[PDB]
């Protein structure tokens, strides 16, 4: 318990069903065709349908939702923009030139030796980086007046075709010469060497010695594409390009230089960025002298133990629901079975392992079966038992759980199993509902994304994935009507503001979602 528990205007029980989306199409629809008399009634009259995929939850458009993203958005009361979406917005709205860390890196160059490097994967793969991001970096750096800019081009061939490198090379050459008239290519080397993540420091060292010492094949802007073509004819493709060296010593990473890695995916940046700025050049086992007084910046955070500034550092996620309730001295209860336990803790609480004052947790063991189609009810009955225990106790003004079966049994593709999982879930929801009415709680039912409403593809094949359908938001309290946001569809970011309103509690400024009920 906690001091302000009774100050609440309504106690609230929040059920997050996993993989339960709203489809009116009945073909392969495990929810519709299951016996679901409880959700049939809760999803009628005054209920809402809210978005849980795509840009509504901070993911690229057209991308299905998932448990990690959905629980994060529900618990956070705000859209958390995924790196790709975030940086692409910055690029389109010309926001690199005002980016705090970038201005800081250019200021460092301008106040120092004038020299700045860009390094990263040059292609349109979109997994680790995007060439468009690098171009926007060059344009902004030019406008910020940095004297001297060098690029270190890492060849892809893995997220793009093995012989696409020469085209991105041509683009980059032409862009630097004709579009910016500013910036110079200094290095070309394959990701095999530059972007190892398996502690193969003999691979890293190839890239490192090219950047630091110019160890590789000499060329220039007139010749480098031809050099690459010859490597292709020799059967050495983008991923495996051995170093090509441009601009001579001018283009090496030298004493006092500044460097920006522009990849947004951290795993393949940690080795080379630590060789440059985290005192791990020793593992490269090079005979070259390591430059002194380097400063490294990353596009995103590569490791929290690194001293590097990030152009797009993590969302801090201050005052997600779990934190805000403890701040208001209100206790809370989070319950899931094993398969979704992280989702009601780590992810619901903001994507980090932090448990707040007054927060109680309960884990219900998932059944020990080979696949969950073999026990489609999983442990839903047990989660409901623990929630009913809490409702009868009345201790916690906010309680929430996850029900695993529709998502986890849906991933098996077994339609009749998915039906049984939706029936087990509905039964458990009905038992929680009856306990809430007997002990003075309002019930809200939602989901983190869809899944079990589409168990068959059009060709009748099994559909084992999440979906882009809307999810429910229900509310048993009769003193409220569901209303839409002014400017957009409702989405998961609105669940927590609505709970707080119903609870009579304040909304923190960091929750930029909105309550979607009116009193």
């Amino acid at each position: 318990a906690m001091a302000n528990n009774s100050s609440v205007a309504n106690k609230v029980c929040l059920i997050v069903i996993d993989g339960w989306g709203v489809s009116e199409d009945p073909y392969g629809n495990a929810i519709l065709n299951a016996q679901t008399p409880v959700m049939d009634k809760l999803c009628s009259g005054n209920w809402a349908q809210i978005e849980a995929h795509g840009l509504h939850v901070g993911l690229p458009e057209g991308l299905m939702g998932n448990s990690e993203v959905g629980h994060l958005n529900i618990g956070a009361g705000r859209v958390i923009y995924q790196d790709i979406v975030r940086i692409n917005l910055a690029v389109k709205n010309n926001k690199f030139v005002t980016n705090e860390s970038l201005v800081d890196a250019c200021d460092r160059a301008k106040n120092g030796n004038g020299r700045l490097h860009l390094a990263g994967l040059v292609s349109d793969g979109g997994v680790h980086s995007h060439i468009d991001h690098m171009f926007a970096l060059v344009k902004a750096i030019k406008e910020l007046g940095v004297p001297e800019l060098y690029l270190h081009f890492y060849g892809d061939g893995r997220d793009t075709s093995p012989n696409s490198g020469v085209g991105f090379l041509e683009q980059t050459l032409e862009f630097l010469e004709k579009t910016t008239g500013y910036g110079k290519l200094a290095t070309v080397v394959g990701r095999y060497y530059a972007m190892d993540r398996d502690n193969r420091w003999e691979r890293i060292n190839v890239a490192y010695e090219a950047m630091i010492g110019g160890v590789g094949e000499t060329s220039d802007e007139a010749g480098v594409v031809e050099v690459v073509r010859k490597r292709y004819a020799a059967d050495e493709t983008d991923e495996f390009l051995k170093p090509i060296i441009l601009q001579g010593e001018k283009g090496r990473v030298q004493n006092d230089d500044t460097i920006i890695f522009f990849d947004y995916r951290a795993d393949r940046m940690r080795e080379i960025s630590a060789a440059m700025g985290m005192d791990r050049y020793k593992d490269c086992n090079s005979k070259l002298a390591h430059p002194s007084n380097l400063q490294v910046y990353g596009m995103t955070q590569y490791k929290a133990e690194f001293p590097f500034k990030s152009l797009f550092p993590p969302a801090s996620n201050k005052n997600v629901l779990a934190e805000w309730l403890a701040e208001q001295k209100v206790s809370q209860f989070h319950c899931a079975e094993t398969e979704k336990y992280a989702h009601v803790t780590f992810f619901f609480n903001g994507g980090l392992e932090k448990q707040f004052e007054g927060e109680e947790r309960c884990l219900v063991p998932s059944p020990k079966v080979a696949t969950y189609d073999l026990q489609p009810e999983m442990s839903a009955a047990g989660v409901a038992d623990k929630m009913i225990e809490q409702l009868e106790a009345g201790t916690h003004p906010f309680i929430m759980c996850n029900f695993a079966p529709p998502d986890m049994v849906g991933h098996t593709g077994v339609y009749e199993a998915a039906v049984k999982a939706c029936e087990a879930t509905d039964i458990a929801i009905g038992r929680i509902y009856e306990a809430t009415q007997k002990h003075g709680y309002s019930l809200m039912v939602t989901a983190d994304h869809g899944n079990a409403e589409k168990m068959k593809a059009p060709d009748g094949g099994k559909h084992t994935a999440h979906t882009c359908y809307r999810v429910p938001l229900t509310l048993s309290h009769p003193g409220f009507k569901f209303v839409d946001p002014a400017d957009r569809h409702p989405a998961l970011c609105d669940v927590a503001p609505t709970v707080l309103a119903i609870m009579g509690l304040p909304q923190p400024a960091e929750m930029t979602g909105v309550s979607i009920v009116q009193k």
Binding site: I84, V127, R265, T300, P314, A315, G351, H411
Partner: peptide, 14 residues
Amino acid sequence: XDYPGDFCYLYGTC
């Protein structure tokens, strides 16, 4: 998994 919105959130576990 290291920070909210990082690459692992694109598709998640499942």
